[PDB]
Amino acid sequence: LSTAILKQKNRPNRLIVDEAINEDNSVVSLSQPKMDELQLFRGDTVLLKGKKRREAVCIVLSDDTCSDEKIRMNRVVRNNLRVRLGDVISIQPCPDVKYGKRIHVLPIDDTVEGITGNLFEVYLKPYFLEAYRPIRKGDIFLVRGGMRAVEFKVVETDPSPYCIVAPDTVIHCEGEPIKREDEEESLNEVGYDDIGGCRKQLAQIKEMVELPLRHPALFKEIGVKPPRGILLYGPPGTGKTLIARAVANETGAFFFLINGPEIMSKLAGESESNLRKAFEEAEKNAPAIIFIDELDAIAPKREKTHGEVERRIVSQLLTLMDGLKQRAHVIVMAATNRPNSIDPALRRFGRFDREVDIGIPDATGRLEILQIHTKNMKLADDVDLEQVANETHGHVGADLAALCSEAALQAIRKKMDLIDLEDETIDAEVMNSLAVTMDDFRWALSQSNPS
């Protein structure tokens, strides 16, 4: 009703992700009745939009066994789009794709332990030979070559970001293997889905940041100026910084992050350069979102603040906030857990003149969060999160995370007589037996604390 901006719409080309029949990386299945509706001929190269602004490039074919409003893609494709089976994507005609000049691709470290021989010969040459594949920068794809299957990451393409791999395409694969861990972190980067119990506020954010930038005309037409300063506040630990993350990954804009405590670590005047440098960068690449985390760290009350360089920064900032031209297309977001200590001049109209309170979560919010956290944890069947939710009154996001971490330990703890700290490696059986029992939670619960 007021959460309207969130419920996404039934549209011609929003299709649910079904498991693939055809097993090929560059292939996507569609019902014939659909392919026509979207004016899509066979072997056409298409563009796919996923989550967290991830993109994939594929070739399209008709599947008899595929529902109209469903689409098949393998796990490699589900990965680049960052979607689980049952999620929904945008399909779009990608007609002007150019042939590939040169591509640079590296293998993942934990998929090459063993023989080198020749990676191009054994793996890449055949996978690409006479295939004419579409690929995007930052695609991770798997190639089987006789005895092994190896994962490769598309480091660079000419032309960026996408090209077709033709016979003329020079393929470079020399370099240091990509580290798995980094690419683990990359998958794990926070989306909107990863924040819980903030629907109301999430709405406002999109309404004040995402919307004014994606569709500036709605405001033009109606004849009003969008606000340009948004200040999130909340009792400590409520996913303010966490939202900072989501937006960066999720937003269509050029994003620049500023960390109060990090600014203030610089030499006198070194900070003023960085402060300008940020605002200049943002203008140069507009539309942009500048985000200031822990604002209070750089904007105490000038009157009540002791150091001299210290006031200069509040002044320095104020100036920049004000120095933003209308045509600039920059929204400054920021966040504190102590709003009242921030110099009031910054909350004057035309500066940070919009607030999003990010309060304690209620019963269902806790349940939401608990779900988001445990989504990759090993839990016993006897674990009831609704219970936890109810028993966790006054917890916030960070309190809950802690709770989970604690029970997890307690679980690990129950294996601690079976294991000695000294051992070089752990008995592989027990490892698999390990799970967080509901009892583990009740222990963690018995230990919990105020926010």
Tell me how far, at minimum, the Cβ of 159 lies from ligand AGS, in Å: 37
For Mg ion, the closer of residues 92 and 241 by Cβ is 241
Q: What is the total count of residues that contact ligand AGS (CB under 6 A)?
A: 21
Q: Which residues in the 290-309 window bind ligand AGS by CB under 6 A?
A: 294
Stretch that binds Mg ion, among 60-68, 177-185, 214-222, 238-246 (CB under 5 A): 238-246
Query: For residue 227, which of 84, 324, 300 has the smallest C-alpha distance?
Result: 324
Cα gap 149→127, rounded to integer Å: 12
Q: What are the angstrom distances between the C-alpha of 148 and each of 62, 129, 139, 151, 206? A: 31, 19, 20, 10, 45
**From ligand AGS, Mg ion, a copy of itself, none, which one binds at residue 238 (CB under 5 to 8 Å depending on kind)?**
ligand AGS
Cα gap 82→103, rounded to integer Å: 23
The binder of ligand AGS chosen from 197, 229, 260, 287 (CB under 6 A): 197
**From ligand AGS, Mg ion, a copy of itself, none, which one binds at residue 357 (CB under 5 to 8 Å depending on kind)?**
none
Query: For residue 356, which of 275, 254, 247, 264 has the smallest C-alpha distance?
Result: 247
Question: What single DSSP character describes residue 206?
Answer: I
Tell me how far, at minimum, the Cβ of 21 lies from a copy of itself, in Å: 28
Task: Report if residue 401 touches ligand AGS, rule: CB under 6 A.
Answer: yes
For Mg ion, the closer of residues 319 and 433 by Cβ is 319
Task: Report if residue 259 touches Mg ion, rule: CB under 5 A.
Answer: no
For a copy of itself, the closer of residues 181 and 193 by Cβ is 181
Task: Report if residue 236 touches ligand AGS, rule: CB under 6 A.
Answer: yes
Name beta bridge partners: 59. 27, 45
Stretch that binds ligand AGS, among 134-142, 145-153, 238-246, 258-266 (CB under 6 A): 238-246
**From a copy of itself, Mg ion, ligand AGS, none, which one binds at residue 318 (CB under 5 to 8 Å depending on kind)?**
a copy of itself
Alpha-carbon radius of gyration of the chain: 26
Tell me how far, at minimum, the Cβ of 345 lies from ligand AGS, in Å: 7
Strands (E) in 302-432, as ranges, are 330-336, 354-357
Task: Report if residue 274 touches Mg ion, rule: CB under 5 A.
Answer: no
Task: Report if residue 107 touches ligand AGS, rule: CB under 6 A.
Answer: no
Q: Taking a C-beta distance cutoff of 8 angstroms, is the pair 159, 98 a contact? A: yes
Task: Report if residue 224 touches ligand AGS, rule: CB under 6 A.
Answer: no
Q: Which residues in the 326-345 window bind ligand AGS by CB under 6 A?
A: 337
Q: Which residues in the 357-386 window bind ligand AGS by CB under 6 A?
A: 369, 372
Cα gap 408→377, rounded to integer Å: 9
**Amino acid code (one letter) for 351:** R
Cα gap 445→438, rounded to integer Å: 10
Q: Taking a C-beta distance cutoff of 8 angstroms, is the pair 56, 80 a contact? A: yes
Stretch that binds ligand AGS, among 2-10, 121-129, 214-222, 239-247 (CB under 6 A): 239-247
Cα gap 67→77, rounded to integer Å: 19
Task: Report if residue 314 touches ligand AGS, rule: CB under 6 A.
Answer: no
Q: Burial level of 129, CB count in 10 A (0-12/13-18/19+)?
A: exposed
**Sequence ranges of the binding site for ATP:** 236-242, 337, 373
Tokens of 375: 């989504």
Crossing angle of helices 438-447/397-413, nearest 10°?
120
Residue nearest to Mg ion according to CB distances in the complex:
241
Task: Report if residue 398 touches ligand AGS, rule: CB under 6 A.
Answer: yes
Tell me how far, at minimum, the Cβ of 72 lies from a copy of itself, in Å: 22
Query: For residue 100, which of 128, 75, 70 has the smallest C-alpha distance?
Result: 128
The binder of Mg ion chosen from 32, 92, 204, 241 (CB under 5 A): 241
Tell me how far, at minimum, the Cβ of 349 lies from a copy of itself, in Å: 4
Helix (H/G/I), strand (E/B), else coil: 318: helix
DSSP notation for 29-86: EE-HHHHHHTT--TT-EEEEE-STT-EEEEEEEE-TTS-TTEEEE-HHHHHHTT--TT
Stretch that binds ligand AGS, among 62-70, 114-122, 192-200, 383-391 (CB under 6 A): 192-200
The binder of ligand AGS chosen from 237, 260, 287, 300 (CB under 6 A): 237
Helix (H) or strand (E) segment spanning residue 135: strand 133-136
Tell me how far, at minimum, the Cβ of 242 lies from Mg ion, in Å: 8
Binding positions for ligand AGS, rule: CB under 6 A: 195-198, 234, 236-242, 294, 337, 348-349, 369, 372, 397-398, 401
Binding positions for Mg ion, rule: CB under 5 A: 241
